[PDB]
Amino acid sequence: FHRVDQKEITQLSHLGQGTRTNVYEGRLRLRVVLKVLDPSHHDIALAFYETASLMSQVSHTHLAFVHGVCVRGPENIMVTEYVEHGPLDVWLRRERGHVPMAWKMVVAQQLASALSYLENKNLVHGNVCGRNILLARLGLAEGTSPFIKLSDPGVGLGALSREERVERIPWLAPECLPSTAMDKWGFGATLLEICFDGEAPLRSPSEKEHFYQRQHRLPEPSLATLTSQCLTYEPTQRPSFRTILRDL
Numbered sequence: 001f002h003r004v005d006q007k008e009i010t011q012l013s014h015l016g017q018g019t020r021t022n023v024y025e026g027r028l029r030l031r032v033v034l035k036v037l038d039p040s041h042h043d044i045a046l047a048f049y050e051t052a053s054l055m056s057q058v059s060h061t062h063l064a065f066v067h068g069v070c071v072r073g074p075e076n077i078m079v080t081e082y083v084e085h086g087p088l089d090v091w092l093r094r095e096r097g098h099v100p101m102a103w104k105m106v107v108a109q110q111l112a113s114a115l116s117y118l119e120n121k122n123l124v125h126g127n128v129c130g131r132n133i134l135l136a137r138l139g140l141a142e143g144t145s146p147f148i149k150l151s152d153p154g155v156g157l158g159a160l161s162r163e164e165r166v167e168r169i170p171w172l173a174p175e176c177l178p179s180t181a182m183d184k185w186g187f188g189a190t191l192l193e194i195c196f197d198g199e200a201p202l203r204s205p206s207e208k209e210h211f212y213q214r215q216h217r218l219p220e221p222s223l224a225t226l227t228s229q230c231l232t233y234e235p236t237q238r239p240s241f242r243t244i245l246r247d248l
């Protein structure tokens with residue numbers, strides 16, 4: 001990744017919070033987003049640097065760009081693409097009941113394309129969810145289509161606590177509660193979330209953890225065969241993104 005000096009960035013309005021991060025609008029000597037990691041253990045900063053490294057080595061129409069990393073005292077900052085309309089989950093809840101199925105199918109295909117690209121390079125995202133899908137274009141006007149960018153996955157899944165992994169249910173693959181196969185589950189859970197206008201299935205941390213421990217399966221979408229195949233507890237039985245992209 002590219003090293004960004006603190007003199008090259010300007011921190012503006014708070015946008016929201018991610019896992020161990022605060023996300024702000026900013027300027028780069030370009031409008032950007034600044035993902036400020038909390039003062040953290042070296043294992044967490046390393047998992048954050050691994051994400052910056054992964055996203056700086058890939059290039060895809062539907063993957064958000066990473067400008068680089070800035071170290072500002074105890075704060076690690078990932079300088080990433082400012083995407084015009086922000087997260088898909090927020091937008092879906094605001095537009096609940098007025099998002100057509102054809103619009104949702106375009107998003108699913110664009111997301112499956114980004115994930116097929118990663119799968120072919122044997123790279124894991126590990127945080128596929130509506131919150132990490134950003135809208136560059138809304139596709140509300142006649143003759144237009146939405147355009148998504150899959151955000152960086154933030155602090156790597158391998159560095160998170162059990163409590164943080166439970167907070168990720170239902171996007172978290174069940175085998176991760178105690179491989180590219182995990183993104184097939186994240187993809188399936190994101191299709192449910194999109195189908196339900198940003199209302200993902202599953203509640204308290206104990207109820208979510210009990211759901212996976214008891215091997216219960218997620219609700220069917222209101223995409224039924226595809227979610228049923230992606231959301232299986234057997235990782236090797238999940239279809240490839242080549243097959244998913246064909247089935248879509």
Ligand SMILES: CNc1cc(Nc2cc(C)cc(C)c2)nn2c(C(N)=O)cnc12
Pocket residue numbers: 015016017018023033080081082083084085086087090134151152
């Ligand atoms: C207008 N643009 C954007 C808004 C936004 N808001 C946001 C909204 C919540 C609820 C949470 C977080 C972490 C950010 N995030 N974002 C990103 C990104 N998180 O990578 C990239 N561009 C944008």
